[PDB]
Amino acid sequence: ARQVTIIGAGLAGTLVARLLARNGWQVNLFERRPDPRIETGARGRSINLALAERGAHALRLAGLEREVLAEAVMMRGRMVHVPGTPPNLQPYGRDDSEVIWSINRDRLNRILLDGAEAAGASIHFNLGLDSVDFARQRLTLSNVSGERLEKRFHLLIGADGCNSAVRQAMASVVDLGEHLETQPHGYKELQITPEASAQFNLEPNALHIWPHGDYMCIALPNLDRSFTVTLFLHHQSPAAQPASPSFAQLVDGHAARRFFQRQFPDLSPMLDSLEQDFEHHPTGKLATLRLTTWHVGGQAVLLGDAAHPMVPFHGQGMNCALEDAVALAEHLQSAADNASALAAFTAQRQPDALAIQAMALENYVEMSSSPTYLLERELGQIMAQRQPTRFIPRYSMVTFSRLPYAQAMARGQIQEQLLKFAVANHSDLTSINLDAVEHEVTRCLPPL
Ligand SMILES: Cc1cc2nc3c(=O)[nH]c(=O)nc-3n(C[C@H](O)[C@H](O)[C@H](O)COP(=O)(O)OP(=O)(O)OC[C@H]3O[C@@H](n4cnc5c(N)ncnc54)[C@H](O)[C@@H]3O)c2cc1C
Numbered sequence: 001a002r003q004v005t006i007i008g009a010g011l012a013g014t015l016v017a018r019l020l021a022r023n024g025w026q027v028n029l030f031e032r033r034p035d036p037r038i039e040t041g042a043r044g045r046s047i048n049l050a051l052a053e054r055g056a057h058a059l060r061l062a063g064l065e066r067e068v069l070a071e072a073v074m075m076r077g078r079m080v081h082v083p084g085t086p087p088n089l090q091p092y093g094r095d096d097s098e099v100i101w102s103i104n105r106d107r108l109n110r111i112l113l114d115g116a117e118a119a120g121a122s123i124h125f126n127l128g129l130d131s132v133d134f135a136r137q138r139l140t141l142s143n144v145s146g147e148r149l150e151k152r153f154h155l156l157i158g159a160d161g162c163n164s165a166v167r168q169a170m171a172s173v174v175d176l177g178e179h180l181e182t183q184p185h186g187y188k189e190l191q192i193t194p195e196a197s198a199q200f201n202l203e204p205n206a207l208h209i210w211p212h213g214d215y216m217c218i219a220l221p222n223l224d225r226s227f228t229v230t231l232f233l234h235h236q237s238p239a240a241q242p243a244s245p246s247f248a249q250l251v252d253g254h255a256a257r258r259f260f261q262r263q264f265p266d267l268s269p270m271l272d273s274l275e276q277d278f279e280h281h282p283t284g285k286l287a288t289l290r291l292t293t294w295h296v297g298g299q300a301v302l303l304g305d306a307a308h309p310m311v312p313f314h315g316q317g318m319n320c321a322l323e324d325a326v327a328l329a330e331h332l333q334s335a336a337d338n339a340s341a342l343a344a345f346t347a348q349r350q351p352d353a354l355a356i357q358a359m360a361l362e363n364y365v366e367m368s369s370s371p372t373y374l375l376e377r378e379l380g381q382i383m384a385q386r387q388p389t390r391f392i393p394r395y396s397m398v399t400f401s402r403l404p405y406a407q408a409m410a411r412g413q414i415q416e417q418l419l420k421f422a423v424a425n426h427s428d429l430t431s432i433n434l435d436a437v438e439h440e441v442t443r444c445l446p447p448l
């Protein structure tokens, strides 16, 4: 039986542990945090995420989809809250088969842990990777107190998140060709209780957005009708706009309350614990990190956030990480050797990770910050109606299909240019020749 050591019992690491263990690999998975399945007297994490077709299909292959979906809330569409305008749902797809699912992060992680153990993986908690000696094939782990433990390894999988210790260890034996693109927005998680969401008639089966140009709020529903709200706001005000809102200006919870009362007046009354949440929940950091290299020979490989940190504006990081886990297990299972598997996995996934990193950055303006847009959207709908196997909106290709991200991006670019050019010198749809636009669709977009 082939042996593997996985660092990080998060989403990708646990899924790849199950896929490999059920194929007979001897799997040891190491996690810095305690086992979340061991109930303590501490209050649990209300953190949630959007599960889409890529993630759901990965869970389906693993035999875990039904269990995960049993505690997921359907989000049929985007509910945009602009003061004055009544909120009106913008459906994501054609029917309820084209939806996204809101799931509690910790619940997803517990289901994956049970799944990895049921397949035969051994999971070791309270052990964070500190260093790797590639030449001697040993690694060093430690608990929070720094009590060290050394282990021999044969194949090392870094599924240890955006601040990957495996990636840091690889960077000492190979040039990873890392390019870091910092994101000016920080984030803060806030809560809407079930009583407040019901009192204000906040739709449970939708993804909610409060756009505000350079900043915005989003909310995802929970099974109990509470919502987790995320504020995206610049860490600091730029030199060009010193007065512009930023986390630096929000000195305490009371300052945060005044900011919400002014900028998000229909949201502030639903946020009963705004002051406490603001002061007790730390401000998160966002970034895009691109690597030229994801592996060291046949010895180690990165996947998920360890390989390609991305901004969260498309809700695709976990989806991508689960898609990576499937691809990695498939390559490892069937390759001539580990070195061939890792090189093939990297070559296949790198262009797709670059594509979703670029599309995630682009989705921010779509959510937060039109006259030409409406006519383009209108013409796009007719083209999707006339040619449903050729004209598929980029959001649908990314969210509801398994088309490689790079292909979704390439087809999306053709569509965006086609629409932009077609509407360019026209006031309305009546002056636009629909057959000439459809001609371009049949000429430039092969059927899927
Ligand atoms: C604000 C925000 C919202 C998001 N919303 C969505 C969404 O709606 N949909 C979506 O698809 N994605 C979303 N994402 C992205 C998603 O959270 C990540 O892409 C995903 O969790 C990556 O999975 P992973 O397994 O690679 O890493 P992680 O889930 O971070 O797991 C890494 C694991 O490694 C462990 N670890 C770290 N260092 C060590 C070490 N040295 N030794 C041992 N263990 C270690 C960690 O404790 C953790 O258990 C969001 C991200 C952010 C920041």
Ligand SMILES: O=C(O)CCn1c(=O)oc2cc(Cl)c(Cl)cc21
Binding pocket: 050, 078, 100, 207, 218, 230, 312, 313, 314, 315, 316, 363, 366, 367
């Ligand atoms: O474009 C939209 O209507 C939503 C995009 N999105 C998503 O699907 O899941 C998400 C999760 C988060 Cl955290 C963010 Cl910021 C956006 C999304």
Ligand SMILES: [Cl-]
Binding pocket: 310, 311, 312, 313, 314, 315, 316, 317, 318
């Ligand atoms: Cl994301």
